[PDB]
């Protein structure tokens, strides 16, 4: 009931989220320096993309007003004047159980459609989802709401090989020249770093679906979550270093006992002069093999890869593409 | 009517010198009377502890110390006297009740008339209430953002226990923000502003021993002979918000308990064991600096003649109990006077001194209204264990010599590194490096300290030699060299950073 | 009875005495943290009585101390003028002053071998093997080691920490034995700190003081692993005989 997701993504020469002084955030793992992207970064970057679609899948497709079918229609409250509210429930996005209130406390009163102000009772959309509150913790602009957490554990993304920051000497050039040229605008130095990041996250549908209900709504939230986890990339200095990419390896596993990360597989840093994607793939495989043959369990494993050279056995059945993998895994999750 | 007196109501977490199991709550009179039976008393807030220990010391000095010097070689005779009270071993219960007999009506927090160190007149005369949030520390006030220290939305105010209320109250009455508090209309005059706390942003040093008794009498600073004055709760008439605060040469005016810069009040609940609302605002508007500087703090002189307390630093609390070790040294101008008049041998303690331990309550903050962190620091008894376990005079002296040496040099390079980073960053641009450099420097350099105390092979230098062997100096080179390493690439930053980097190499006594 | 958790992974941060922006961690785990983890593995919501977790014992052997790093952490920035974290009064701040900046510290690249000894240790172990909430190390964003529970059942697990447990590679002199490793037991105590957990409810966090004594013990040098890839291997073969 724990959807674990691992992904190897190589980011080029850029600076995703800098530190307090310009450098990119770094951890020192297995003795060696390793640039990292904070979990918050890759969170506000996934969320800010989820709502952008989930919260838009869609006011022009599924719609919220398109209710009544279970409280305003097959209930008697003006089976034809159904727009009763509807139009009276407007003057974020909820699931279904918390929608029972949407069509529930939307009846009674009078009504006043004969020509509509009691909202302190419906406003509690987030107090009970707002699925975007059960997937990820509370909102960021609303007071707490009984469910501060959580569920989607997100891990920091550190490189799989020691990478040192590199100073990018840069300068600004003023376009109005005096009779003493070369007086550029402002000399300065900006630090950048490149490398192949490892990323990981968990989704606990077990203690999740409860807070919501309709396993179908939950299924949609987790599926779009995984797609946003691979799809998104932070928005730090991208307009100056376009570093938009996709993970070179994607491994979703559904475990029925406990989530597990593969971070220690990358403990001993990798020396290079060659590429790092293939070595990282086969090494993650190896670690999955010994860990799988030491902690045996009946779990589901699947993975996609943008390189047909190696065959990853311990990672499950190699699906063809990311969305196929996500579909078959979310389906296999229940 | 709701009433809560600190005399018998339990609000202090106390534990005895016995088994050390199941400590429990005690009032003020109860922890005082049987102090001889209790090991120590504490409250979770170190600010509240820094003021609590001041009022406790002032009480014990009201009865035990007698807080009044005689007149025949006063200082000396006083040290003798208190040495006799220490020799006896405990408190006189009829003296405790003899002191409350004169003030049994003062200690009620919710007294309807003249409460305990609050302003009853401030009940009315205030248009709005400051709210309990502003009284509680680490709790989101009106303008703060609701993220940390547990959500508190200015509404549904979680009522605080009267214990927590006297803790936060006693702390806020001590450390206190400066600026834009609840307005008061004094004699028709309204003035919305307030001054800062007296102890705001400073580390306090309180000695503590085996039994709470000797700790109390050791926390008694020599009462400056002068016009005998009283603490805040003894004054017969309530102070005037306008006018200059009363002056006090006596200890009650040097422990900062004669007049406070703030004025809080608790609105009782009908139950009597909960606070529902509070008031926090200015009590005195005309500035006044306290003469006879505070014996607990450490003071340092700047240019122009002003003397100021050395501010606190979370960077020093990166390792536990760092300032606690000031009992070694000592240290060059870095020593509280209370210690300079109770820890040494020029006093008359005989064997409690051989078990004395230092404690430090620090709450770093900005001097205006922004708070950063609190922390306590009790010295490691293990450093005493090592000196006692060997039972060899020359080795008993070589060990303590090694701790003294390592500590002195440790902080020496700490401050030398601070000026190194301040000049490096202030000259590079022609700072932000001090925070990282120092944090990483102490965090990294303390395991070396524990490495030297157990004469184990440390970085740079192997056991066997006389002192610290000049090792954490190399640790300072490590921290400094890495905090500014990625930025010393171009020759400008390289030569300036290096020019300031050629200082860590001193003292640097060779092999 | 008892079991041996293996506190490791990329980052660990057991906080204490920090109720403001600046957050700090201890150079070793705190019982409040890992008891919060057991409590998270058994499904007790904040506010429930934690008396069950009393009577437990935690001696922890530090394998490597790990280096301390400060994590800069801004929250609410870049968001428009009408979305930040509200104020108590409800009136937001200006967008130029809206975000709040916390610089939370954390301990990185360290591994501890704790030895839990308690009456409920077996259900705790079986809870860590399948929890009712993602178990973390210090804070939610830190993901724990896969081998979070190194050995599930051992009588006198302290003796297991003193002998026959893999250690990471460190400098070992020629034919030298008796390599020191510090372990903390709970006179001659090192420090007192607020660890014992009394209540976790977000409305009133309540803790208490607890004694801690760090004893540097000696261990035979036959446990130090090789340079690279040897440590994880040896610990895998070590967890292999757990069934036996």
UniProtKB/TrEMBL annotation, chain A:
InterPro entries: CRISPR-assoc_prot_CT1975
Superkingdom of origin organism: Bacteria
Name of the protein described by the UniProt record: CRISPR-associated protein, Cse4 family
Source species of the chain: Thermobifida fusca (strain YX)
From TrEMBL, chain B:
CDD domains hit by this protein: Cse1_I-E (cd09729)
Domain of life: Bacteria
Signal peptide: none
Lineage summary: Bacteria, Bacillati, Actinomycetota, Actinomycetes, Streptosporangiales
The protein's name in its UniProt record: CRISPR-associated protein, Cse1 family
From TrEMBL, chain C:
Pfam family of the protein (one): Cas_Cas5d
One Gene Ontology MF term: RNA binding
InterPro entries: CRISPR-assoc_prot_Cas5, CRISPR-assoc_prot_Cas5_N, CRISPR-assoc_prot_CasD
Coiled-coil intervals, chain numbering: none
GO biological process: defense response to virus; maintenance of CRISPR repeat elements
Keywords: Antiviral defense
Domain of life: Bacteria
Protein name, per record: CRISPR-associated protein, Cas5e family
Annotated source species: Thermobifida fusca (strain YX)
């Amino acid at each position: 009931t724990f959807v674990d997701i691992h992904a190897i993504q190589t980011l080029p020469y850029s600076n995703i989220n800098r530190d307090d002084l310009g450098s990119p955030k770094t951890v020192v793992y297995g003795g060696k320096e390793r640039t990292r992207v904070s979990s918050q970064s890759w969170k506000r970057a996934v969320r800010h993309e989820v709502e952008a679609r989930l919260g838009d899948k869609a006011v022009r497709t599924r719609r919220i007003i398109s209710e009544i079918a279970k409280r305003l229609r097959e209930r008697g409250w003006d089976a034809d004047l159904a727009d009763a509210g509807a139009r009276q429930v407007v003057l974020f996005y909820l699931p279904v159980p918390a929608i029972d209130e949407l069509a529930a406390i939307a009846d009674e009163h009078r009504d006043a459609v004969a020509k509509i102000l009691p909202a302190d009772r419906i406003t509690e959309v987030l107090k009970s989802r707002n699925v975007s509150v059960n997937l990820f913790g509370r909102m960021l602009a609303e007071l707490p709401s009984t469910e501060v957490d959580g569920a989607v554990q997100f891990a920091h993304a550190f490189t799989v090989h020691g990478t040192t920051v590199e100073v990018d000497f840069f300068t600004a050039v003023d376009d109005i020249p005096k009779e003493n040229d070369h007086g550029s605008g402002h000399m300065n130095a900006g630090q950048f770093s490149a490398g192949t990041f490892y990323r990981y996250a968990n989704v606990n549908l077990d203690r999740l679906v409860e807070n919501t209900g309709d396993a179908q709504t939950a299924r949609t939230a987790v599926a779009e979550f995984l797609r946003a986890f691979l799809s998104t990339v932070p928005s730090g200095k991208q307009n100056a270093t376009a570093a938009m990419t996709l993970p070179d390896l994607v491994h979703i596993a559904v475990r029925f006992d406990r989530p597990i990360s593969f971070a220690p597989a990358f403990e001993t840093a990798l020396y290079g002069s060659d590429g790092y994607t293939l070595r990282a793939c086969q090494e993650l495989n190896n670690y999955a093999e010994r860990l799988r043959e030491v902690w045996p369990d009946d779990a589901i494993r699947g993975y996609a890869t943008v390189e047909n050279k190696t065959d990853l056995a311990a990672l499950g059945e190699r699906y063809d593409s990311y969305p196929a993998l996500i579909d078959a895994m979310v389906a296999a999750a229940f | 009517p709701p009433s809560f007196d600190v005399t018998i109501a339990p609000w202090l977490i106390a534990r005895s010198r016995d088994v050390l199991a199941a400590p429990e709550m005690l009032g003020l009179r109860d922890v005082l009377i049987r102090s001889h039976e209790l090991s120590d008393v504490e409250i979770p807030l170190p600010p509240g502890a820094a003021v609590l220990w001041r009022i406790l010391a002032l009480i014990t000095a009201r009865i035990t110390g007698l807080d009044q010097p005689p007149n025949k070689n006063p200082k000396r005779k006083w040290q003798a006297r208190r040495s006799q009270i220490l020799s006896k071993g405990r408190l006189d219960p009829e003296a405790v009740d003899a002191y409350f007999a004169d003030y049994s009506e003062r200690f009620d927090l919710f007294h309807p008339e003249r409460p305990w160190l609050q302003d009853p007149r401030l009940r009315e005369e205030c248009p709005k209430t400051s709210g309990v949030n502003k009284l509680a520390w680490g709790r989101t006030a009106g303008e703060n953002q609701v993220w940390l220290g547990g959500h508190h939305h200015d509404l549904d105010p979680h009522p605080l226990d009267s214990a927590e209320a006297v803790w936060h109250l006693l702390a806020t009455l001590g450390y206190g923000p400066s600026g834009m508090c609840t307005a008061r209309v004094v004699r028709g005059r309204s003035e919305r502003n307030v001054t800062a706390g007296p102890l705001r942003g400073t580390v306090s040093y309180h000695p503590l021993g085996r039994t709470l008794f000797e700790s109390l009498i050791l926390n008694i600073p020599y009462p400056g002979t002068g016009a005998a004055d009283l603490a805040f709760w003894e004054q017969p008439e309530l102070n005037d918000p306008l006018g200059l605060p009363e002056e006090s040469a006596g200890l009650a005016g040097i422990l900062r308990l004669d007049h406070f810069r703030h004025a809080v009040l608790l609105h009782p609940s009908p139950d009597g064991s909960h606070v529902v609302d509070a008031w926090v605002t200015w009590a005195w508007r005309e500035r006044n600096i306290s003469p006879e500087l505070d014996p607990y703090l450490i003071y340092q002189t700047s240019k122009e003649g002003r003397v100021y307390p050395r501010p606190a630093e979370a960077e020093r609390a990166i390792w536990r109990d760092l300032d606690a070790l000031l009992h070694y040294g000592e240290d060059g101008n870095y020593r509280p006077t209370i210690l300079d008049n109770c820890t040494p041998l020029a006093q008359v303690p005989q064997e409690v001194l051989d078990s004395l331990r230092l404690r430090a309550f620090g709450f770093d903050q900005d001097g205006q209204a922004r708070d950063k962190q609190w922390f306590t620091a009790t010295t490691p008894a293990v450093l005493r264990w090592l000196a006692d376990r060997e039972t060899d005079d020359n080795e008993n002296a070589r060990i303590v010599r090694r701790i003294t040496l390592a500590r002195k040099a440790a902080e020496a390079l700490g401050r030398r590194l601070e000026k190194a980073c301040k000049e490096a960053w202030k000259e590079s641009n022609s700072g932000p490096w001090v925070q990282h450099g120092m944090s990483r420097y102490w965090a990294k350099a303390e395991p070396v300290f524990w490495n030297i105390v157990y004469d184990r092979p440390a970085q740079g230098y192997t056991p066997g030699m006389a002192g610290p062997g000049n090792a954490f100096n190399l640790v300072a080179l490590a921290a400094y060299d890495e905090v500014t390493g990625p930025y010393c690439e171009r020759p400008r930053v390289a030569k300036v950073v290096e020019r300031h980097r050629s200082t860590l190499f001193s003292n640097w006594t060779p092999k | 009875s008892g079991f041996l958790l293996r506190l490791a992974g990329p980052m660990q941060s057991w906080g204490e005495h920090s109720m403001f922006g600046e957050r700090d961690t201890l150079p070793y785990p705190s019982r409040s943290g890992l008891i919060g983890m057991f409590a998270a593995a058994q499904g007790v919501r904040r506010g429930d009585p934690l008396d069950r977790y009393k009577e437990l014992k935690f001696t922890v052997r530090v394998d490597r101390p790990g280096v301390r790093l400060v994590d800069f952490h801004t929250i609410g920035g870049g968001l428009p003028k009408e979305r930040t974290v509200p104020t108590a009064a409800g009136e937001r701040r200006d967008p130029k002053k809206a975000t709040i900046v916390t610089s939370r510290s954390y301990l990185a690249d360290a591994v501890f071998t704790v030895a839990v000894t308690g009456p409920e240790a077996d259900t705790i172990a079986d809870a860590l093997a399948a929890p009712y909430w993602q178990p973390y190390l210090g804070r939610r964003a830190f993901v724990p080691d896969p081998l979070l529970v190194l050995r599930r059942r051992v009588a006198d697990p302290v003796r297991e920490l003193v002998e026959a447990v893999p250690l990471p590679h460190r400098r070992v002199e020629e034919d030298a034995a008796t390599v020191l490793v510090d372990l903390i037991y709970e006179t001659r105590t090192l420090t007192v700190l607020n660890d014992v957990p009394l209540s976790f409810d977000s409305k009133s966090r309540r803790y208490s003081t607890r004694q801690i004594r760090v004893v540097p013990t000696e261990v035979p040098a036959t446990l130090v692993a090789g340079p690279g890839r040897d440590y994880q291997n040896k610990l895998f073969t070590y967890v292999k005989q757990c069934a036996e």
